[PDB]
RNA sequence: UAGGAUAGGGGCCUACCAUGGUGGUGACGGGUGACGGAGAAUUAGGGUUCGAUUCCGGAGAGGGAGCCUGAGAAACGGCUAC
RNA sequence: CGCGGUAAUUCCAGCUCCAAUAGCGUAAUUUAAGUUGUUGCAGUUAAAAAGCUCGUAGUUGGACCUUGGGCCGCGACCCCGUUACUUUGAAGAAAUUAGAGUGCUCAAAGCAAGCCAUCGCUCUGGAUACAUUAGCAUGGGAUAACAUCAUAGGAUUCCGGUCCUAGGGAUCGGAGUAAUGAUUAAUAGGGACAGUCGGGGGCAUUCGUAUUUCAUAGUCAGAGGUGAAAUUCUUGGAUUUAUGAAAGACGAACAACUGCGAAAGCAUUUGCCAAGGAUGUUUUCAUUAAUCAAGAACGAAAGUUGGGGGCUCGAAGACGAUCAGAUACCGUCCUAGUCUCAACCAUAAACGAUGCCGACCAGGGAUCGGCGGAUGUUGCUUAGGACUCCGCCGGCACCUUAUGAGAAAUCAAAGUCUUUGGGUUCCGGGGGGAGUAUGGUCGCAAGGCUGAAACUUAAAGGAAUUGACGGAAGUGGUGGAGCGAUUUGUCCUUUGUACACACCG
């Protein structure tokens, strides 16, 4: 039984795709197959935000952010609940979270 | 697809010739290994009762099948022949002529009896059916 | 389909239905013929002669005007090439690739393309020998 | 549209112009020859619309057309008429 | 490549008839396809057809009347004597009452009944019913 | 090519000469519990398998070999030898 | 397939019943078998598409050329290239087969016989068909194969020459003649040209941070690593911080249901070299083509031989843990290796588990490359670029739908299949034994290619359903769907399963 039409990856009209290394376990996963998330967080937890914005010499100072594109293998993405097992009908939905 | 050309008769014939060897029946017939069988292509064979033996049935069944160990006369090959018809082992004695036949599945083992494809049909010139039905008696 | 690739292009020219010259064509037949003769005299091949007669002269198609093809006209006046033009160009490509490989040994891709080019050369040479447009013992090395 | 709504022998001429040159009832070229009129000098010098050659005015003047992927680009300041 | 233009013609006609189309375009055209189409028209299985001259291999536009169940070619064009026509019709025709096998004979391209009427054998082009 | 031999053609054999001849369209070799065919069994059609045996053809008379007689035999209910 | 463990429809018997019947049981071959498939099977997942491409033989190959017409009357009329194929004829022993006749009493047979009775007769009968292939002959030329196929240099009159021979013949020339003699250009193919496009390839070149090492400088008790630890480093400055240099790899983010390449594969700059697809074309040749045994080219990673390099990581190894054990998973240090050159190796779940070429047959919106048209705004340098819109061709794909197919999953091809035939290559025939033995061949080796049998076994296997389980996540009716088990209704659920005695499996 073939579970997915794309075989669990994104590879059409090409042969080899270079792999990445999983952020958690350092597993070798193809770049097109690995689960990829772009996390834009703040260097300061929502809580420390006020305390830090207070201890600032410069009154006008937007707190810098953190940008990171995180790579995950299937096992770690499922374990971390980044992706969850879905019903047969819902698997064909590729739309990002509504 | 398969070749279809009017001029491709040789291709088709050669392909069929090569593929017929995949069929088990064809290869059994045309390999020549049936001449190395104990019977060497004959329906029946005679032999000497070497010793009376009892071999256990398969796992689901629990019985002692009580076959016979027979040395054929035409080639000196030793085989195990089943003795049907309850009580007919007592008609079988060592150094006694027996006519063996196939067990009905063409060299394949039959029923719950493992490794036996031969049955005793006639002993000392008298059929086992006659001795079972008391139609004749075994000569002394 | 491309003979030596999976490309399936269908780009090509489409000759008009009308096989007679358009009324605006006024060049006399002998004029276009001697123009072709000069064109071949410097060394142009019939494809280039047709291209020039098309884009630099009022001649859309030679066959419509004269009634004959460029190679036939050149053969009539004894200016046809010895090696046919397509084979000439294929051999030129082959010798260019061979020179490149004499400089570049690791170029395995160019070696594969050279094998393809020489296969095309052998095909076309076989056809030309069968049609007797090449010497019966003509050989490519 | 639905071919049951058309006649394959008498196709609508509006939609035949947009078909590939070879996919028409009778294939015809979409190229043409033109009488290019230069700025001041007469030099009609008929040009192929899809010319692959840089057409030069007879009096060795500036170039008149430029080869492209498709139709040739007439030089700046030149008119033309189909033939 | 195009190996049998007759096969492409008949298969396109069959697909168009199954689709319910009332017109089918055939390309390339050939004398054998026009001769097969004439037999088809004579037996009433198609309507008008039009050869379109394009100074190349032509085009045929055939009117369809919904009376076709199937038309196909036999490849290869097996040699069929007059005596083997019965076996061929049993192989290919739905019944002994309807259907036609098209033969190429030295007397012309014709259906199997007409081939029997002149006692001429040949090669099988195809069938329609 | 020229002979010899044979009832007669022929490397059938001899002398000389040339380097040919066959082969994946399978030569050569091996297997056959292979004499060939007419035929036989089973077969919707197509086919599969068999064909020692009374008709036709071939071959052998324990195995080889060699002959005499005779129109006709390399005979075996003829001979000679191993 | 199963039965027999105390109620045996199955054993041993009796009774009764059943089938065939003067017969019936038991132990190679045909049928069944469309399970050998030419008719007529398969190869996404059940067995099975070669890793990929080229390529000889073989097999297969676009269209085009004397048609109409009427008359008479189904025949005819009029306006010194082959072969296949087909038609007809002659042959193809008899017996056998099919079949005509015939009351051996019937029949299997046989080739006899029959007749009012007959010194005899019916000339009594003792037919006919079939008979591949190959051979011979007749008619036909649609289809197809092979051979040709613009020095046709064609032919025909007149005028000649030479030779032979009772004027004739043969041979070689001059001059006259005719519609002087060439199918078109395939939404086949090759080649040319044009502007492009690409992470296609080779060579050289540039850059990038990281990492390791080293040098300098600051600081002082931990650093490292894990679930927790420990192995290990560290007051002779570990770890951390800054600067600089060297080395070797590696080319993030951009980066995609995107591109290029025959596949493998290919991602820093620039330059050079050769190559390529698509598009455009009123350029050229003119069938040159498709697929391919033989034979070649390339072919991830690991591996082999030697040189260089050796940062990182890291088989083997050592040690530390965990553990009932732990030759593992976790941690530390690491050898070969990972990088490069030369020479080999030729294997991958080398996968789309789907060979290639060609035709047809739904709809739709994206996207990439090229081209055409229409646009109205550009930190733009009129064109053109950038956006926008509409088309055409080509490419990677995607969505919906069944009118299709399928065992279904699913597939717009895996469709156009018992209404079965477009071309071609490879390749499968229940499960194991077995990709094993042996032989051969290639390779230094590792191994690769080719490749059994004996024997064993009643299933193995595929898809889907329900349930159960998970050290996974969070009850009818009628109607509708499904070939169906089932399902909807009923909105513990979803999910995986090789379990169904149901994980105590
Ligand atoms: K993914
Ligand atoms: K092109
Ligand atoms: K002789
Ligand atoms: K001789
Ligand atoms: K005599
Ligand atoms: K597109
Ligand atoms: K219901
Ligand atoms: Mg791969
Ligand atoms: Mg002689
Ligand atoms: Mg024998
Ligand atoms: Mg016989
Ligand atoms: Mg014998
Ligand atoms: Mg006898
Ligand atoms: Mg005899
Ligand atoms: Mg004799
Ligand atoms: Mg004897
Ligand atoms: Mg003798
Ligand atoms: Mg005797
Ligand atoms: Mg005798
Ligand atoms: Mg009983
Ligand atoms: Mg099957
Ligand atoms: Mg499997
Ligand atoms: Mg499989
Ligand atoms: Mg043809
Ligand atoms: Mg393999
Ligand atoms: Mg495979
Ligand atoms: Mg493949
Ligand atoms: Mg079929
Ligand atoms: Mg098997
Ligand atoms: Mg219901
Ligand atoms: Mg699964
Ligand atoms: Zn992971």
Numbering used by the authors:
A (entry chain a): 2 to 99
B (entry chain X): 2 to 141
C (entry chain N): 2 to 142
D (entry chain b): 2 to 84
E (entry chain W): 2 to 130
Give the published text.
Ribosome is a molecular machine that translates genomic information into the amino acid sequence. While the large ribosomal subunit functions only as a part of a whole ribosome, participating in the elongation of a protein chain, the small subunit has extra functions, being responsible for the initiation of translation and for the recycling of ribosomes after termination. We report a high-resolution (2.3–2.5 Å) cryo-EM reconstruction of the Triticum aestivum (common wheat) 40S ribosomal subunit. By implementing the multibody refinement algorithm, we obtained cryo-EM reconstructions of both the head and body domains with nominal resolutions of 2.55 Å and 2.34 Å, respectively, extended to 2.0–2.2 Å in the most stable internal regions.
The more ambiguous situation arose in the case of very short protein eL41, virtually a peptide, which is situated at the interface side, binding both the large and small ribosomal subunits. We succeeded in proving the acetylation of only one N-methionine in the protein eS21. In addition, as in the case of tomato ribosome structure, an extra density in the backbone of Asp137 in ribosomal protein uS11 indicates its conversion to isoaspartate (isoAsp) via dehydration followed by hydrolysis. For instance, 2′-O of Um428 in human 18S rRNA is methylated, while corresponding ribose in wheat (U384) remains unmodified, therefore being able to form an H-bond with the OH-group of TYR7 in plant-specific 5′-end of uS4 protein. Interestingly, the fourth latent coordinate is not related to the mobility of the head domain but describes the motion of the ES6d 18S rRNA expansion segment, sometimes referred as a “right foot”. Unlike the first three coordinates describing mobility of the head domain, the major part of this motion is not a rotation around a certain vector but basically a rigid-body 11 Å shift of a significant part of the rRNA chain, coupled with only 1.5° turn. Analysis of the intermediate density maps describing the transition along the fourth coordinate revealed that the C-terminus of ribosomal protein eS6 remains bound to the ES6d segment, and its very long α-helix can act like a spring to provide this unusual motion.
